[PDB]
RNA sequence: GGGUAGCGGAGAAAUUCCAAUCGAACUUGGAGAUAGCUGGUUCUCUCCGAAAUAGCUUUAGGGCUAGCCUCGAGGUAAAGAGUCAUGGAGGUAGAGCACUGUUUGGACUAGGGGCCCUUCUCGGGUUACCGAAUUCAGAUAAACUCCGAAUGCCAUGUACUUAUACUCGGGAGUCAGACUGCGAGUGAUAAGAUCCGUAGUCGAAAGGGAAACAGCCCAGACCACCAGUUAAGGUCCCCAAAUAUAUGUUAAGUGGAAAAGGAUGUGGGGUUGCUUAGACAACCAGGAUGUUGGCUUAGAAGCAGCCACCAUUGAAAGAGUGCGUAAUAGCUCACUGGUCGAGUGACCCCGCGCCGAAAAUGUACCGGGGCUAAACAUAUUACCGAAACUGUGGAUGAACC
RNA sequence: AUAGGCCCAGGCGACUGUUUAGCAAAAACACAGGUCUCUGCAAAACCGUAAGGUGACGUAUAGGGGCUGACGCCUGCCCGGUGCUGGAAGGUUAAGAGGAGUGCUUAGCUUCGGCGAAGGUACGAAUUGAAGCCCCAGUAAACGGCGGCCGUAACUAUAACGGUCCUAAGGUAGCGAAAUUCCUUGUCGGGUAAGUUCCGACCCGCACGAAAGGCGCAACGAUCUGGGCACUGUCUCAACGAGAGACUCGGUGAAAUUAUAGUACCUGUGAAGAUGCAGGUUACCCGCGACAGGACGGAAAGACCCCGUGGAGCUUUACUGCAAC
RNA sequence: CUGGGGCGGUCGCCUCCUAAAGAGUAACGGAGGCGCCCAAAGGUUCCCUCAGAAUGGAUGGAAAUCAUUCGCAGAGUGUAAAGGCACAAGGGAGCUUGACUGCGAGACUGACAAGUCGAGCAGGGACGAAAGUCGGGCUUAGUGAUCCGGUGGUUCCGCAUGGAAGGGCCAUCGCUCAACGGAUAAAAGCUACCCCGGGGAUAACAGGCUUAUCUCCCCCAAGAGUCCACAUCGACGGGGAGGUUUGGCACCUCGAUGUCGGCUCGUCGCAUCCUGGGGCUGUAGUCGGUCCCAAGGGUUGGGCUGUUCGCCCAUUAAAGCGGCAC
RNA sequence: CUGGUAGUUAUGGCGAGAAGGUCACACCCGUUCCCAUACCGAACACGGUAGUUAAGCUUCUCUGCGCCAAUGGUAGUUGGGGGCUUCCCCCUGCGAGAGUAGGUCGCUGCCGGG
């Protein structure tokens, strides 16, 4: 996941406080797995959850990313001072608020979506909840 | 390959709603017209709001989404 | 959208360079590369300044641009100043073939003793191209060339202890990921079961092979390697379980896939994955016969197989994708020659009986009259060894088969 | 014994030698060279009391003007400060998707590309391979805004408090700041980091607390007192004051470092299934019959594997829950009557605890002792506790009578 | 008692000499030899303002300067650039010469307005006016520089031979992991039980490279490098003995250093490494012989590093100058 | 200038974000522009409305022009961006030169130098029937002082007097002075042969903070392991501890904390190399593996490399890893 | 009653449906004159009033679109305190945006004709 292009490369860290003004309620799936605190996912830990969630289904029911990284991160390298600008771009992030529904799943028995969800929030930097429409 | 900026130009209100004015007051430095000329105002080249006559400035709606200032005596 | 490269070659008197360069294009495709050049120089000895001569070096410059090539492969591997004189009169990127291959495995690679393997190549190839600017970073700008007690040199440990202490680090760290590979090894061998190893060049399709002798004659057989029309699919050894419909048993081990001019770092990380054919009953080769250049393919396979240590074992030199020719039938055998299609059943049926000819020999036919208490040692009979005829007397049972040595020294009273 | 002398000699050449001096000798003079640099600069009390910023600078550890201090003077609807009221400018927090960008999933047709193709791929029929719109639902933003606070800011008043303000002169110092809280950037949402904003303290602030501890908490030292009351923080002993009162919690020395995650810890709630017409635990029978159900296989007889998983005697027993056999035999469960005589079994929420928890001289992650409260929670009240405030006496500045 | 240790194999320098008085004795300097160049004699060159000198009481087989460095074999291609030397007489240029003209001034003349001789004065055009430069030739033991592309070379020549492009010309002979080698502890051998050093073949400098010489080389060296024999307290691993000092006594008697000191340890704390602060733990008072962990011990206002619109020496196609020519 | 200095980059002006809803506000913070242009692209009068899409039409194609309907701006606005603009500031046409001279109450902005806006008055105009608008351009960049020269003008001065020379005043022109408040008309390097003044304001060593990186330990469990996730391993991801690495910072020390390796002497931690005890094992046995407890003692001679390290020879029960100013 | 002309954040607008007409208003007929079209009497201008409410215009109904909009709660937040400090919680005051009940097919002034 990366946005296909950004107006700006280089984009301020932001801040995470408050409740998600948006995506707190299951929407399409039966089942979503909700961030209880606060954290940066980037698309690497997305990307290990959703495999997880869906090596776990079988090719069966549905899942949704409801979190997209839309920020930009940079680093500079070891061996370099601070100064001579902003380091470069090196992954994508999703600033999750808590009470953000990051994944939802339908199409798949009650017992199996909540194993998927555990398999996915095992690779997430976030203490989450399972939650049911 | 940044580092550059101008001289910030100090626009905005330059007296307030209810206060006595001479004439020639810069009422208002603006780029464009946020705010426009009401009664014995005038609107200078540089979209600078001005009092032709003494009085007391008010800042009235023009009409929904506009403004203007008027200096009554 | 696959990025532009270009691609240069040259015959140091090579004896199918056509060939070397077909392949670091099909390389350059598995990297995900669009070769939109190939720059072919036909001089004897390499230029030890640029690779190629210094006149050819703006003949791609030229091309490079016409083209809007991004970077620039070479099909040998470039010594460091080598690298830089081409860096500055391209001014553009550059990549040798080691490097492209390192690019390959990183990707393909998906386990840990994997992983450390081609970390440990990548930081060996890319050390010395640091260690030359490592020196030269800063020697213009330095300590006055060091007239305090500050101590210690910026020349040495500037290089050799940002990178080699870490290959140091890399290194102990296999070693013991390797150690441990004799303790999964441990039960195979003390059971002395024989080890049937298949090796050859990439896409040859000998994961294909395995998978074939996996659906037929394995007791799990929900269980297939990955197969692919990509080079190098595989990079970890598998060992599977073959039970012959007779009740014969060996283990089938599929490898790492060889290809020309491989890296000889890679080839020292090589060794731990071929620890099972070099200690192999048997050693399949699988060559891909419908390829027009199949003996460039494995005489440069045995090449390696040398130089990691694969020696005096008995090999069988099986040529598959029959099928894609309309000449050759499908099934075929001429001593150490096997002509074979991997799809098909009849072929394995046949590379089965194959193997049972040179691992099975010692295996000779013997008569048993096992009395009815004892029943246990007729299911050992139906269970570990070939039964022709079963005959029934009131006394006992009697049964003649083909068993080892081993089981005639354990029902030697009958 | 002689010669070569410093803008110079001499040199088989080293910057080598020219009186213990040599990349340019010694001595006197110019000369008290110059030094935006370092060091130093000597009696007392009283009143006030900064700054470590802006701009410009061959400027960056210097300077100049301004800002901030001080002294004098002047005029002065008091023009300063706070609050209330009233008015107003302004797009931040939040929010939102109306615009702009980023984006998920449907539905919808265009098309092109796969796919078959009477075809010239002109036209059909399919697609889930892409696709640009289109709507429906749903997200997202420092450089988005249909919206939009709290504060802060500018004014006005015939409001109530308060006591500064401004102008002109004389004299400055300052232009390395530090940490803490809050809001930002840079950094890795590291730094006792760096850079702004904003408040405070230190600087230039002694006192009490925080073991010790500029920058944290409390609070400002005019002098004296063997007086009193309080602040933070405390009250078992070191050590002044509660071994205080009430009701609970904790067993970990948790308290008195440490996360993902793990768990039959312990207290409280709240749903809920079975239950003296007998549960749950154990103990006493029974746990059969078709039948080795069929296929499969050498053998598969409940129990390698595949496919079915019906009925039967009644108290009910699966075409079988685990072991066992080579296959059988054998032991066991489910599932029922009997005995026994009260509870027993799931799930969710909260409090406090547990594991996760390894570093180098010596206990060493409460200052110590030591504590099962001397810990924690909620509520209460006494006391101790400062150079705070008060009392008494004294000294002293200013203003006004 | 006093009197060479020796041998094998490399590098460098021919050699004996010379050198950083006082951290370098060498591979550096010198050297004989080589070559270039200047110099016709009041020589050139050098010192000196000059006179006067050295050169030389010499005279091209001589003298000055540059480079190289015995000897042996050799020293390739390039004169396009830069220098030097010569040529040519066009272009440009200075002072000087020249003085057409033009301002200013005024005796007059004025039709008002303006004209305006003579003289004076302030400028001044053409024309004239050298070297240098611009231009052409030479010169590399002057400063310097010494390429690609495409085929055939079946081999074998890392660098041939044949086509082309560019260049002033394309690095010749010889040599090559080197006092020079990034990949590189290059590859194979030797030597050792074990050899990143050493030695010798392959590969190797993008060609190291021919008088800032290339390649050899007997003799020579307090030169550097590798190996062997001798021999041994160098070491296994230390023991004993002698003298001088140390120590005690008698005589004599300094020094650096030093805020005052009744000057423990641990863990912490603090300008972030405490004898001195906190909490603990130890500890009777005073010495002598010993040892150096600490007193961020002593010594020297850090040589490194930065800064200062601080110096100084050196360079040059930095600026501005000056001698000399 | 500079998270030491050098190298690289930058130096003045304009727009935005950072900027915390007045103004202002830093960083070698994030993004872009400028060193002009225009005789109309200026003034004024009058008149007008754009983009795009749907639909139909010859060359005509997805897209030229025409017609219709729907279209608050999805266009345009010389030129970045922001703020504006449909009574248009956007688009036509007619006449024009106000892209005027003298000024200017009073404000804004500013340390200063400068910069910005300005009703209104007079002269004389342009357009307009008049009202009126017009001292350039929708607004905000497009610039550079003084000194010294040049040209033009002049009821100014003219060194006894008349002139003149020369100066003054008004107008205007000539340097990337761009390091853009400009040291001069005129300015590059080396110092390891160095020197003085200073600085822990500032680097190299060691300490400190930090812990990205590093080492070690874990969680999840897709895989590997002959069947078999968890004997032994473990991808994708996730969470810690440690303070031995590579780094960041510049807090102590520049009136000296004076040095890598080795030698001598050790001492400490335990994340244990050996020896002791145990659990699991792919533990038949032997030989092993792995984890728990365990720091009492022990833990080597050589060759090569200056080498820590490493490689090798030969041993050993073992040839542990770290800390203590490496 | 209708023409003109103002004021008022669209509660005023748009869209849909209906009715009305010498009392104006309008379209409508003409291009001789003033005056027009970068072509066109379309527009602009001028002269007419045969014809018609079809459209604009005026009045009436409608909540489909827009627009306006409480209360309550929440977010945020000044000040004051706490923590386990990517942040979170408590007290006091202020208090959105969204959403909702609901409101709206305007209101108001002058002048002429009726
Ligand atoms: N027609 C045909 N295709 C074959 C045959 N054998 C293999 N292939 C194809 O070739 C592909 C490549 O062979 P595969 O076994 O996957 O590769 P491999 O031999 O394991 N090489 P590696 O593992 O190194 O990548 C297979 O995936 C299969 O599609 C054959 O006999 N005939
Ligand atoms: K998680
Ligand atoms: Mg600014
Ligand atoms: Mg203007
Ligand atoms: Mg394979
Ligand atoms: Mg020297
Ligand atoms: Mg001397
Ligand atoms: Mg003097
Ligand atoms: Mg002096
Ligand atoms: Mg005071
Ligand atoms: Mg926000
Ligand atoms: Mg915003
Ligand atoms: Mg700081
Ligand atoms: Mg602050
Ligand atoms: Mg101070
Ligand atoms: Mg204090
Ligand atoms: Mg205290
Ligand atoms: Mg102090
Ligand atoms: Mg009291
Ligand atoms: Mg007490
Ligand atoms: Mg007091
Ligand atoms: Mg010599
Ligand atoms: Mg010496
Ligand atoms: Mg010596
Ligand atoms: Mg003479
Ligand atoms: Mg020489
Ligand atoms: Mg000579
Ligand atoms: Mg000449
Ligand atoms: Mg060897
Ligand atoms: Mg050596
Ligand atoms: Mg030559
Ligand atoms: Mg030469
Ligand atoms: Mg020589
Ligand atoms: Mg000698
Ligand atoms: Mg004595
Ligand atoms: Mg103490
Ligand atoms: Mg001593
Ligand atoms: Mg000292
Ligand atoms: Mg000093
Ligand atoms: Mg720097
Ligand atoms: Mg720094
Ligand atoms: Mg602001
Ligand atoms: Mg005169
Ligand atoms: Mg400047
Ligand atoms: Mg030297
Ligand atoms: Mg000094
Ligand atoms: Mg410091
Ligand atoms: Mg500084
Ligand atoms: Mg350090
Ligand atoms: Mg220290
Ligand atoms: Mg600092
Ligand atoms: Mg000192
Ligand atoms: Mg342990
Ligand atoms: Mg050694
Ligand atoms: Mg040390």
């Known amino acids: ?59 069966g029911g549905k899942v949704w990313i409801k979190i997209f990284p839309h920020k930009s991160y940079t680093s500079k390298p070891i061996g370099v001072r601070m100064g001579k600008g902003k380091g470069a771009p090196e992954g994508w992030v999703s600033p999750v608020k808590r009470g953000k529904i990051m994944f939802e799943i339908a199409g798949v028995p009650e017992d199996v979506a909540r194993e998927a969800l555990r398999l996915a929030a095992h690779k997430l930097p976030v203490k989450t909840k399972i939650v049911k429409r | 390959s940044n580092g550059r900026d101008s001289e910030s130009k100090r626009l905005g209100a330059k007296r307030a709603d209810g206060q006595f004015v001479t004439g020639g007051s810069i009422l208002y430095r603006q780029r464009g017209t946020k705010i426009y000329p009401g009664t014995n105002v005038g609107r200078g080249g540089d979209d600078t709001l001005f009092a032709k006559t003494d009085g007391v400035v008010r800042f009235e709606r023009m009409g929904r989404d506009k403004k203007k200032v008027s200096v009554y005596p | 959208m696959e990025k532009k490269v270009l691609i240069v070659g040259i015959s140091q008197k090579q004896k199918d360079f056509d060939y070397s360069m077909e392949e670091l294009a099909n390389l350059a495709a598995a990297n995900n590369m669009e070769v939109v050049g190939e720059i072919r120089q036909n001089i004897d000895r390499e230029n030890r300044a640029t690779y190629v001569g210094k006149g050819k070096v703006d003949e791609i410059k030229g091309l490079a641009e016409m083209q809007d090539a991004r970077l620039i492969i070479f099909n040998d591997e470039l010594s460091p100043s080598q690298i830089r004189n081409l860096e500055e009169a391209l001014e553009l990127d550059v990549m040798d073939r080691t490097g492209l291959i390192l690019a390959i495995f990183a990707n393909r690679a998906k386990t840990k003793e994997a992983q450390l393997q081609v970390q440990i190549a990548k930081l060996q190839y890319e050390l010395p191209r640091i260690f030359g600017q490592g020196e030269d970073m800063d020697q213009q700008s330095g300590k006055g060339g060091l007239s305090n007690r500050g101590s210690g040199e910026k020349k040495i440990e500037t290089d050799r202890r940002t990178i080699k202490h870490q290959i140091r680090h890399l290194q102990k760290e296999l070693d013991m990921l390797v150690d441990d590979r004799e303790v999964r090894r441990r039960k195979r061998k003390k059971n002395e079961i024989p080890v049937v190893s298949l090796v050859g060049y990439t896409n040859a ?65 090589f060794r731990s994955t071929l620890e099972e054919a070099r200690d192999a009953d048997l050693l399949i080769h699988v060559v891909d016969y419908s390829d027009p250049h199949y003996k460039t393919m494995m005489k440069t396979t045995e090449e390696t197989l040398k130089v990691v240590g694969v020696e005096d074992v008995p090999v069988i030199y099986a040529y598959n994708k029959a099928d894609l020719l309309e000449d050759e039938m499908y099934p075929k055998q001429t001593g ?41 040692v007729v299911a050992y009979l139906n269970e570990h060894a070939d039964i022709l005829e079963t005959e029934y007397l009131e006394n006992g049972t009697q049964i003649v088969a083909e068993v080892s040595p081993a089981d005639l020294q354990k029902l030697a009273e009958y």
Not at chain 3, 216 to 243: G, H, P, W
């Open chain 3, 336 to 376: 150490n020659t096997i002509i074979f299609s991997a799809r098909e059943e009849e072929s394995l049926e046949f590379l089965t009986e194959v193997i049972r000819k040179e691992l099975f020999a010692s295996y000779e036919k013997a008569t048993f009259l096992i009395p009815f208490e004892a029943g246990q």
């Open chain 3, 205 to 269: 399709g000998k994961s294909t092979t395995m998978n074939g002798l996996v659906r037929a004659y394995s007791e799990t057989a929900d269980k297939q390697v990955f197969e692919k029309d990509m080079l190098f699919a595989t990079l970890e050894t598998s060992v599977r379980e073959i039970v012959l419909p007779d009740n014969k048993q060996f283990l089938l081990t599929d490898t790492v896939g060889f290809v020309s001019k491989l890296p000889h770092q890679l080839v020292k990380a």
């Open chain 1, 1 to 59: 996941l990366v946005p296909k292009r950004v107006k700006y490369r280089r984009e301020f860290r932001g801040n995470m406080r408050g409740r998600a003004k948006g995506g707190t309620e299951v929407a399409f799936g039966e089942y979503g797995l909700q961030a209880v605190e606060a954290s940066w996912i980037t698309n690497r830990q997305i990307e290990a959850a959703r495999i997880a969630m869906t090596r776990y289904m079988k090719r």
